[PDB]
Amino acid sequence: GDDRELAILATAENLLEDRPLADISVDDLAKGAGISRPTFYFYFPSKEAVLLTLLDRVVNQADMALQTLAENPADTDRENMWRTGINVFFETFGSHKAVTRAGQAARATSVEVAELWSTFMQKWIAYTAAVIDAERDRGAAPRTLPAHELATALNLMNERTLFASFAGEQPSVPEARVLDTLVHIWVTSIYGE
Amino acid sequence: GDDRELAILATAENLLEDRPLADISVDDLAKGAGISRPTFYFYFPSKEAVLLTLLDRVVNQADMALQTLAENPADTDRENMWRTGINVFFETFGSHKAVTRAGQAARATSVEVAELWSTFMQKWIAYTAAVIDAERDRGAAPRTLPAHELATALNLMNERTLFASFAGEQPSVPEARVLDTLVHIWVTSIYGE
Ligand SMILES: CC1CCN(C(=O)N[C@H](C)c2ccccc2)CC1
Numbered sequence: 205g206d207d208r209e210l211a212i213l214a215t216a217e218n219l220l221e222d223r224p225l226a227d228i229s230v231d232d233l234a235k236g237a238g239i240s241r242p243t244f245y246f247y248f249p250s251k252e253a254v255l256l257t258l259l260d261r262v263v264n265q266a267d268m269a270l271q272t273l274a275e276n277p278a279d280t281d282r283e284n285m286w287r288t289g290i291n292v293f294f295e296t297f298g299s300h301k302a303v304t305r306a307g308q309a310a311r312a313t314s315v316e317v318a319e320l321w322s323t324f325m326q327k328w329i330a331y332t333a334a335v336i337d338a339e340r341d342r343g344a345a346p347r348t349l350p351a352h353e354l355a356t357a358l359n360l361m362n363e364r365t366l367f368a369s370f371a372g373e374q375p376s377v378p379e380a381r382v383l384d385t386l387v388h389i390w391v392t393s394i395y396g397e
Numbered sequence: 398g399d400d401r402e403l404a405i406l407a408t409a410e411n412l413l414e415d416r417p418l419a420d421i422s423v424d425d426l427a428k429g430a431g432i433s434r435p436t437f438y439f440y441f442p443s444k445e446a447v448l449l450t451l452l453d454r455v456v457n458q459a460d461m462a463l464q465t466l467a468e469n470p471a472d473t474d475r476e477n478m479w480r481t482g483i484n485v486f487f488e489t490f491g492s493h494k495a496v497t498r499a500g501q502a503a504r505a506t507s508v509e510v511a512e513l514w515s516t517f518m519q520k521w522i523a524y525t526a527a528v529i530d531a532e533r534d535r536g537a538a539p540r541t542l543p544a545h546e547l548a549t550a551l552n553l554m555n556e557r558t559l560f561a562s563f564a565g566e567q568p569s570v571p572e573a574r575v576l577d578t579l580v581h582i583w584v585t586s587i588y589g590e
């Protein structure tokens with residue numbers, strides 16, 4: 205039951221490491237999961253729906269990890285606070301590069317993948333903005349740009365820059381330098397006047 | 398000759414304002430350009446090739462505008478220098494939103510659109526890095542991050558943030574606030590310690 209479903213998900217994630225969704229068949233997913241094609245269709249309406257679930261799981265893992273941080277402050281300076289938080293996204297999505305890559309491409313063709321991504325981006329921006337506001341309220345950050353607009357650009361930066369590094373795009377920041385690059389831009393743009 | 402070619406390009410740009418490339422036919426482009434379908438195929442091998450040329454023209458217009466700036470320094474402070482340069486991209490791509498939107502989507506499916514975009518990104522990053530280096534050499538900017546890695550992230554930020562604003566994505570920075578948002582992040586990240 206949940207075991208066949210999990211096997212289909214594992215197969216799909218494994219197969220997306222070697223080729224795109226377009227080059228993967230339902231027969232490929234069924235075969236890999238040790239089930240027939242009609243049995244597959246009992247668990248999922250389409251290969252597209254398999255990706256959506258994989259992405260949903262990755263996105264929620266990141267979100268849950270950020271919630272955990274938000275509830276248990278690490279005892280460090282402000283630079284390290286931002287780094288720790290950006291690192292949740294670096295590690296979570298960096299641990300699922302094929303799902304990241306396929307899921308970002310699916311945004312063009314799938315309304316549900318677009319809305320999933322859009323919902324969580326709004327959440328992570330809102331949280332970023334709340335932290336900047338608290339930093340301004342405590343007098344640690346200067347009142348420069350509208351917090352929510354600053355939050356939006358920094359989050360979009362992270363999205364495009366992390367994804368380019370993971371995919372090895374040209375151009376991209378090397379994966380071993382991307383965390384420090386983002387953290388510097390967040391800290392200088394948040395604290396700087 | 399060049400007139401039929403230009404008419405096909407104009408038709409394609411006009412039609413991309415109302416619908417995507419997938420929903421536009423060669424018969425649509427021929428009709429709009431006042432030519433037959435075989436005559437179309439004399440000028441362009443595909444509707445895809447029409448987009449590639451449109452994007453090529455937009456990209457080169459931006460590039461040429463930046464070259465002009467680079468050769469004639471505006472007499473202002475450093476904030477205004479960056480703003481003027483970011484503004485070339487804001488205005489050029491902002492004046493061709495349908496071509497921008499279609500061309501960015503084509504990156505997934507077209508190797509030539511991917512390589513066009515990649516070539517000019519490398520150029521604009523290299524130029525950004527050269528300016529930061531000169532700023533460091535004159536002692537106006539501190540030696541923080543590797544210039545080229547800083548240049549890469551700021552350019553990727555601009556790409557994703559400008560495009561989200563133009564497309565009205567959720568989330569996005571409002572188009573009337575996006576220039577000031579980017580300029581603040583560039584200036585604080587380039588000059589800040
Ligand atoms: C406290 C903040 C830390 C930094 N954040 C962050 O990088 N979000 C962006 C949008 C992202 C999300 C998933 C994958 C790649 C990038 C948000 C939350």
Ligand SMILES: CC1CCN(C(=O)N[C@H](C)c2ccccc2)CC1
Binds near residue numbers: 518553556
């Ligand atoms: C001096 C620099 C100014 C800012 N630049 C810039 O925004 N480039 C990015 C990559 C971009 C290009 C086209 C469309 C949207 C964004 C580069 C050059």
